[PDB]
Amino acid sequence: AAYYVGYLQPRTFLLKYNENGTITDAVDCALDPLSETKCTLKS
Amino acid sequence: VLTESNKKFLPFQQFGRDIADTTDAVRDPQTLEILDITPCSFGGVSVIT
Ligand SMILES: *[C@@H]1O[C@H](CO)[C@@H](O[C@@H]2O[C@H](CO)[C@@H](O[C@@H]3O[C@H](CO)[C@@H](O)[C@H](O)[C@@H]3O)[C@H](O)[C@H]2NC(C)=O)[C@H](O)[C@H]1NC(C)=O
Numbered sequence: 206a207a208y209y210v211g212y213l214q215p216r217t218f219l220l221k222y223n224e225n226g227t228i229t230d231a232v233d234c235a236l237d238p239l240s241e242t243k244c245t246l247k248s
Numbered sequence: 249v250l251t252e253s254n255k256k257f258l259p260f261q262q263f264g265r266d267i268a269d270t271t272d273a274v275r276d277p278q279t280l281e282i283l284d285i286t287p288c289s290f291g292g293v294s295v296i297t
Pocket residue numbers: 223224225229
């Protein structure tokens with residue numbers, strides 16, 4: 206048996222709700238500069 | 249104006265809000281069905297004379 210513990214972090218997150226309402230893709234705004242631009246551009 | 253919708257609500261989710269933070273779809277508490285919310289028609293009135 207294997208169990209992980211991915212401690213959560215309070216961090217802004219760009220959730221891409223699909224046509225169906227389920228988050229399909231995403232961007233972690235604080236991950237790297239490219240991700241941060243995507244969040245600022247909201248794209 | 250209400251109308252039957254086709255938005256799958258999750259068991260814990262009851263209200264669906266709009267960009268302006270306005271509910272544009274609701275789930276009826278009695279019958280678990282999804283309704284569609286749309287503001288009643290409006291518009292400017294112009295008098296031609
Ligand atoms: C959200 O749900 C709708 C409806 O299922 C998805 O719409 C797209 O609709 C067409 C026609 O239904 C799908 O083609 C196929 O439909 C048949 C049933 O009609 C199904 O058995 C097939 O497996 C196939 O799905 C089309 O695939 C479907 N889109 C997708 C990605 O499956 C809509 O796509 C759903 N949104 C997402 C992001 O999945």
